[PDB]
Amino acid sequence: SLSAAEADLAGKSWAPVFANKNANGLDFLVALFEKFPDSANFFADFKGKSVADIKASPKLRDVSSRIFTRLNEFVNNAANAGKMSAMLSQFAKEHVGFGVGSAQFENVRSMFPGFVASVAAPPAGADAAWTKLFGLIIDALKAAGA
Ligand code: HEM
Numbered sequence: 001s002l003s004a005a006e007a008d009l010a011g012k013s014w015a016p017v018f019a020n021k022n023a024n025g026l027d028f029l030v031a032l033f034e035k036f037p038d039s040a041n042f043f044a045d046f047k048g049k050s051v052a053d054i055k056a057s058p059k060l061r062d063v064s065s066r067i068f069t070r071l072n073e074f075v076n077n078a079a080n081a082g083k084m085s086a087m088l089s090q091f092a093k094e095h096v097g098f099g100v101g102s103a104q105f106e107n108v109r110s111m112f113p114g115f116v117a118s119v120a121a122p123p124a125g126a127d128a129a130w131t132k133l134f135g136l137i138i139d140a141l142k143a144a145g146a
Contacts, residue, residue: 003079
């Protein structure tokens with residue numbers, strides 16, 4: 001897990017992002033796809049389609065919303081190793097079955113801090129908290145077998 005201090009920093013940088021969950025969640029998904037084109041191919045609904053096609057999709061909102069809803073829960077429980085345990089297991093389990101592995105999460109991690117900063121400057125120490133959080137997710141995926 002993260003420490004309470006770290007978790008707070010993550011929550012603090014997340015708030016402005018989560019404040020506009022619909023628009024920001026769609027944006028994160030679009031940015032991912034733009035920076036890491038292979039990612040879309042894991043999605044049944046988006047495989048083959050271009051970013052414009054994805055933006056125009058009536059399915060986009062369903063996807064991006066479930067993602068932000070779960071990220072919000074990770075931010076919320078981050079400092080509790082116990083909840084993280086279960087959360088990480090279950091998340092990894094789920095993703096692996098779809099063929100997603102740690103490398104895709106290494107990509108999310110790379111682009112995350114820059115995405116948050118495009119919404120509002122994060123507090124000092126927040127970027128490191130996110131990379132640690134994503135670090136925990138990456139580890140989970142590896143244990144999950146990918
Ligand atoms: C940024 C962190 C992300 C979060 C919080 C997140 C969250 C989730 C959630 C909550 C589910 C639905 C689980 C279910 O209903 O059983 C899901 C499904 C899935 N996610 Fe993620 N995800 C993350 C990033 C990714 C990445 C990077 C990819 C691929 C590169 C991905 C690929 C998938 C796929 C392929 C599904 C199956 C759902 C479908 O398309 O029908 N996720 N994800």
